Amino acid sequence: VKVKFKYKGEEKEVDTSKIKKVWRVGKFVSFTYDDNGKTGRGAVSEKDAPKELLDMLARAEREK
DNA sequence: GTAATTAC
DNA sequence: GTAATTAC
């Protein structure tokens, strides 16, 4: 499942297998991901987030 | 400005 | 400490 989003004006697609930290900010979901040698950042509205990303969020919230 | 949390 | 992210 690819999460599609624009960040710093750049269009990106990221496989969920590369997504790491996921958290909730207001009505959007923010996350980090492995971006070949560096850790990237991205965010999408909760209403546009794919189910798998929402489940990663649920799991990260329980970890606390 | 705040909301969470980060890379820079 | 800034800029980034969607909404309020």
From Swiss-Prot:
InterPro entries: Chromo-like_dom_sf, DNA-bd_7a-e_arc. It comes from the Archaea. It is found in: Cytoplasm. Its main location: cytoplasm. The keyword Ubl conjugation does not apply. The keyword Nucleotidyltransferase does not apply. The modification N6-methyllysine is found at K4, K6. One of its GO terms (cellular component) is cytoplasm. One of its GO terms (molecular function) is RNA endonuclease activity. Hyperthermostable. Keywords: Cytoplasm, DNA-binding, Methylation. Highly stable from pH 0 to pH 12. NCBIfam families: Sul7d. Sac7a and Sac7b are truncated versions of the Sac7d protein, most likely resulting from post-translational processing, or degradation during isolation. Monomer. This is DNA-binding protein 7d.
